[PDB]
Coordinates of all heavy atoms in Angstrom, one line a residue:
Chain D
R16 N -48.2 -10.8 66.6 CA -47.4 -10.3 67.7 C -46.7 -9.0 67.3 O -45.9 -8.5 68.2 CB -46.3 -11.3 68.1 CG -45.3 -11.6 67.0 CD -44.1 -12.4 67.7 NE -43.1 -13.0 66.8 CZ -42.0 -12.4 66.3 NH1 -41.7 -11.1 66.6 NH2 -41.2 -13.0 65.5
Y29 N -33.5 -3.3 57.0 CA -32.7 -4.4 56.5 C -32.8 -4.5 55.0 O -32.1 -5.3 54.4 CB -33.2 -5.7 57.1 CG -32.7 -6.0 58.5 CD1 -33.6 -6.1 59.6 CD2 -31.3 -6.1 58.7 CE1 -33.1 -6.3 60.8 CE2 -30.9 -6.3 60.0 CZ -31.7 -6.4 61.0 OH -31.3 -6.6 62.3
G46 N -16.7 -14.0 60.3 CA -15.7 -15.0 60.3 C -16.0 -16.2 61.2 O -15.7 -17.4 60.9
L65 N -31.9 -24.7 56.1 CA -32.8 -23.5 56.1 C -32.0 -22.4 56.7 O -31.5 -22.5 57.8 CB -34.1 -23.8 56.8 CG -35.0 -22.6 57.2 CD1 -35.4 -21.8 56.0 CD2 -36.2 -23.0 58.1
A88 N -33.3 -20.3 51.6 CA -32.9 -19.0 52.2 C -34.1 -18.1 52.2 O -34.5 -17.6 51.1 CB -31.7 -18.5 51.4
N106 N -23.4 -18.9 40.4 CA -23.7 -20.2 39.7 C -24.1 -21.2 40.8 O -23.7 -22.4 40.7 CB -22.5 -20.7 39.0 CG -21.9 -19.7 38.0 OD1 -22.5 -19.3 37.1 ND2 -20.6 -19.3 38.3
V118 N -40.7 -16.0 57.6 CA -40.6 -17.5 57.8 C -41.8 -18.0 58.4 O -42.1 -19.2 58.3 CB -39.3 -17.8 58.6 CG1 -39.5 -17.4 60.1 CG2 -39.0 -19.3 58.5
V168 N -27.1 -15.3 77.9 CA -27.1 -13.9 78.3 C -26.4 -13.8 79.7 O -26.7 -14.5 80.6 CB -28.5 -13.2 78.4 CG1 -28.4 -11.7 78.6 CG2 -29.2 -13.5 77.1
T174 N -20.1 -0.3 88.3 CA -20.0 1.1 88.8 C -19.5 2.0 87.7 O -18.5 1.7 87.1 CB -19.1 1.2 90.1 OG1 -19.1 2.5 90.6 CG2 -17.7 0.8 89.7
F194 N -35.7 30.3 80.4 CA -35.2 30.0 79.1 C -35.9 30.9 78.1 O -37.0 30.6 77.7 CB -35.4 28.5 78.8 CG -35.0 28.2 77.4 CD1 -33.7 27.9 77.1 CD2 -36.0 28.1 76.4 CE1 -33.3 27.5 75.8 CE2 -35.6 27.8 75.1 CZ -34.3 27.5 74.8
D208 N -36.7 10.9 83.9 CA -37.3 9.6 83.7 C -37.1 9.1 82.2 O -36.8 7.9 82.0 CB -38.8 9.7 83.9 CG -39.1 10.0 85.4 OD1 -38.2 9.8 86.2 OD2 -40.3 10.4 85.7
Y210 N -34.5 9.8 80.2 CA -33.2 9.3 80.0 C -33.0 7.9 80.7 O -32.3 7.1 80.1 CB -32.2 10.3 80.6 CG -32.0 11.6 79.7 CD1 -32.2 12.8 80.3 CD2 -31.7 11.4 78.4 CE1 -32.0 14.0 79.5 CE2 -31.6 12.6 77.6 CZ -31.8 13.8 78.1 OH -31.6 15.0 77.4
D242 N -41.9 -19.4 75.2 CA -40.9 -19.3 76.3 C -40.3 -17.9 76.3 O -39.7 -17.5 77.4 CB -39.9 -20.3 76.2 CG -40.4 -21.7 76.3 OD1 -41.5 -21.9 76.8 OD2 -39.7 -22.7 75.9
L263 N -26.9 -2.6 85.9 CA -26.5 -4.0 85.4 C -26.0 -3.9 84.0 O -26.6 -3.2 83.1 CB -27.7 -4.9 85.5 CG -28.3 -5.2 86.9 CD1 -29.4 -6.2 86.8 CD2 -27.2 -5.7 87.8
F267 N -23.8 -11.2 75.5 CA -24.2 -12.5 75.2 C -23.2 -13.3 74.4 O -22.4 -12.7 73.7 CB -25.6 -12.5 74.5 CG -25.5 -11.9 73.1 CD1 -25.3 -12.7 72.0 CD2 -25.8 -10.6 72.9 CE1 -25.2 -12.2 70.8 CE2 -25.7 -10.0 71.7 CZ -25.5 -10.8 70.6
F271 N -22.1 -22.8 68.6 CA -22.5 -23.7 67.5 C -22.0 -25.0 67.9 O -20.8 -25.3 67.8 CB -21.8 -23.1 66.2 CG -22.2 -21.7 65.9 CD1 -21.5 -20.7 66.3 CD2 -23.3 -21.5 65.0 CE1 -21.8 -19.4 66.0 CE2 -23.7 -20.2 64.7 CZ -22.9 -19.1 65.2
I272 N -22.9 -25.9 68.2 CA -22.5 -27.2 68.8 C -22.6 -28.2 67.7 O -23.7 -28.8 67.4 CB -23.4 -27.6 70.0 CG1 -23.4 -26.5 71.1 CG2 -23.1 -29.0 70.5 CD1 -24.3 -26.8 72.3
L316 N -38.0 -9.5 81.6 CA -38.2 -9.0 80.2 C -39.5 -9.5 79.7 O -39.8 -10.7 79.6 CB -37.1 -9.6 79.3 CG -35.6 -9.5 79.8 CD1 -34.7 -10.2 78.9 CD2 -35.2 -8.0 80.0
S327 N -37.9 -4.7 83.4 CA -38.0 -4.2 84.7 C -36.9 -4.9 85.6 O -36.8 -6.2 85.5 CB -39.4 -4.6 85.3 OG -39.8 -5.9 85.2
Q334 N -27.7 -7.4 102.9 CA -27.2 -7.1 104.3 C -27.7 -5.8 104.8 O -27.7 -5.6 106.1 CB -25.7 -7.1 104.3 CG -25.0 -8.5 104.1 CD -25.1 -9.0 102.7 OE1 -25.4 -8.3 101.8 NE2 -24.7 -10.3 102.6
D344 N -37.1 0.7 78.2 CA -37.6 0.4 76.9 C -36.5 0.0 76.0 O -35.7 0.8 75.5 CB -38.4 1.6 76.4 CG -39.0 1.4 75.0 OD1 -39.5 0.2 74.8 OD2 -39.1 2.3 74.2
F350 N -27.4 5.2 71.9 CA -26.1 4.8 71.4 C -25.1 5.8 71.8 O -25.0 6.9 71.2 CB -26.2 4.6 69.8 CG -27.1 3.6 69.4 CD1 -28.4 3.9 69.0 CD2 -26.8 2.2 69.5 CE1 -29.3 2.9 68.6 CE2 -27.7 1.2 69.1 CZ -28.9 1.6 68.6

Side-chain angles (χ1 to χ4, degrees):
Chain D
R16 67 163 168 92
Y29 281 117
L65 166 62
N106 310 295
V118 72
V168 188
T174 185
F194 173 85
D208 295 343
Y210 286 128
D242 300 337
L263 300 181
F267 67 91
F271 302 89
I272 301 178
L316 313 176
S327 56
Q334 288 76 11
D344 182 36
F350 298 101

